[PDB]
């Protein structure tokens with residue numbers, strides 16, 4: 094996960 | 100993740 | 107070059123072993139009490155399969171199972187670990203004063219050398235849906251070290267599959283995909299990707315647990331006997347099924363779980379991940395049908411689940427099913443490597 | 451390529467796989483603060499797009515390229531290295547913008563563009579700003595930038611401030627202390643105590659928190675994208691001197707970041723600060739395995755050092771000392787292995 098889930 | 104988190 | 111590297115993309119392997127290199131990930135398995143406790147029980151209560159024996163622990167991780175073989179009296183335990191967790195296992199062998207009895211061998215079981223053959227191989231190589239990670243092949247591969255008539259713990263594995271109805275689980279896929287069904291997201295029409303978004307969600311197996319009431323027929327099982335099986339047998343796994351429907355409703359997919367049996371001299375002990383049993387870190391797995399099927403109690407839901415092993419240490423899953431009485435049909439393709447972890 | 455030389459194939463493969471998923475594009479797109487602010491930045495600076503040539507670095511869905519088109523761009527090259535490129539193309543057709551948006555599949559370090567551009571737009575920010583090393587790809591893309599061309603975003607501010615959060619510290623500490631057990635199912639784990647603490651405290655903590663936990667005014671490190679070269683980002687050195695506003699235990703440093711789109715009409719800020727509405731970047735905290743005691747009026751000084759690695763991230767070291775007592779904490783953090791704590 095480069096980007097965290099919003 | 101091969102193994103799921105658990106608690 | 108190596109049986110392992112042949113069947114495995116380096117990129118997948120690097121991640122895989124990095125994951126298992128983490129103390130927290132070893133700790134995640136260790137704290138599964140059903141898992142760790144049953145392994146301990148299976149070994150200690152079959153103390154005669156271990157007393158003064160030579161043991162191989164395939165993928166020892168922390169060493170935990172090798173310490174259990176030692177508690178049961180084993181003379182010599184070779185503990186093979188491919189990840190950098192091997193170094194930590196080694197530190198534990200010393201600090202628990204078991205240097206004479208446990209020998210940690212860093213590396214892949216497909217690539218290392220053992221000094222001697224063994225009486226028994228122990229391992230925990232089960233992935234979700236049993237087969238994920240392809241570590242069962244490593245475990246079978248390891249039988250090249252097994253003395254004639256040696257044992258394996260675990261000895262057999264059963265996969266269970268059964269149909270389910272879960273309307274809300276099914277609808278969630280569409281509610282998620284419908285993000286794309288808007289003609290003006292900040293002035294942009296995203297609609298043309300809605301179908302591709304649905305396909306993507308439906309390709310993910312769903313990891314979580316559920317009330318057994320959702321199951322619509324008694325499970326069918328597919329069994330692997332680890333004493334007899336060859337690595338090659340897990341490359342293409344075909345599971346036929348003919349369900350006799352106990353309940354009438356919309357069948358939204360198949361549910362998967364598994365059990366393993368430790369068949370010892372003194373007793374057989376079972377480790378079950380069934381939905382009827384307390385929860386484990388394996389939960390259960392459900393494969394949705396993108397078109398569900400109507401069945402009435404008494405009908406037969408027949409078809410095939412085919413798992414085709416891939417170089418990313420997982421399987422391409424193909425499920426095809428029909429209601430025999432009506433001929434309505436559903437086909438599904440899933441990627442076992444990319445599950446949706448739905449559980450809270 | 452410049453890319454493959456600094457990147458492990460194993461990391462790259464996983465990176466672009468993750469972004470190939472419509473679910474992950476959707477995750478970013480649905481961050482309203484992020485997507486709405488990019489839209490406002492671009493449309494409120496229309497004269498920076500009107501009849502211009504644009505490069506979108508890492509276009510994903512195409513979303514920013516559509517905004518550039520809405521603002522009147524003549525031509526937009528939309529570069530994307532994941533399989534998301536094929537979906538972008540579909541959207542470009544379905545939106546009748548084939549004449550203005552041109553998807554180019556590939557890494558911006560490896561593709562060819564038919565001409566130089568007036569402005570580069572990208573959303574290359576990772577958490578703690580620098581994760582993913584995609585800022586390096588964005589700077590790399592300046593080879594296509596006309597002299598006096600613009601960048602959107604134009605600058606990046608990283609903020610850091612010391613925090614107190616004993617609940618966080620204990621949560622992490624308790625997990626580590628699993629490995630303090632002398633008789634886990636009869637086995638002595640205790641010799642891995644220190645290794646375990648090291649591993650847990652190496653994990654940066656991604657979530658939000660109340661600003662009441664901050665113990666001093668934040669220090670700011672700025673990167674000007676119009677002027678930075680790629681290689682500036684290989685070794686990032688952020689020194690700091692905090693004038694402590696409260697007494698108590700310092701559990702680590704908190705980080706967030708802002709970016710400014712410095713247009714010809716107006717400047718538009720996108721902030722991920724904890725005083726602002728939450729974004730999908732949240733905030734990032736680097737915990738110290740032993741907290742530092744400070745008194746209001748003390749100074750906490752040291753260095754945060756970011757060393758680029760080949761896993762598209764950074765080795766981070768934070769050395770902090772309370773000048774008045776000589777009490778110090780040195781820490782190493784593995785920015786690639788964060789703990790996503792948010793409920």
Ligand SMILES: Nc1ncnc2c1ncn2[C@@H]1O[C@H](C[C@@H](N)CC[C@H](N)C(=O)O)[C@@H](O)[C@H]1O
Pocket residue numbers: 110123126127135136164165166167168169170171186187188189191213214215216229230231232241244
């Ligand atoms: N081919 C292989 N060769 C050696 N080790 C492997 C291989 N495949 C997986 N492993 C390791 O096997 C371990 C699997 C774990 N389920 C078990 C760890 C430990 N035995 C336990 O029961 O807690 C991980 O630590 C992997 O790194």
Ligand SMILES: Nc1ncnc2c1ncn2[C@@H]1O[C@H](C[C@@H](N)CC[C@H](N)C(=O)O)[C@@H](O)[C@H]1O
Pocket residue numbers: 453466469470478479507508509510511512513514529530531532534556557558559572573574575584587
């Ligand atoms: N070197 C590279 N070349 C091309 N694309 C890249 C590169 N590195 C990252 N990307 C892509 O950049 C995108 C980063 C996303 N944060 C932004 C997507 C889109 N521009 C948006 O704002 O919604 C991902 O889709 C990556 O696949």
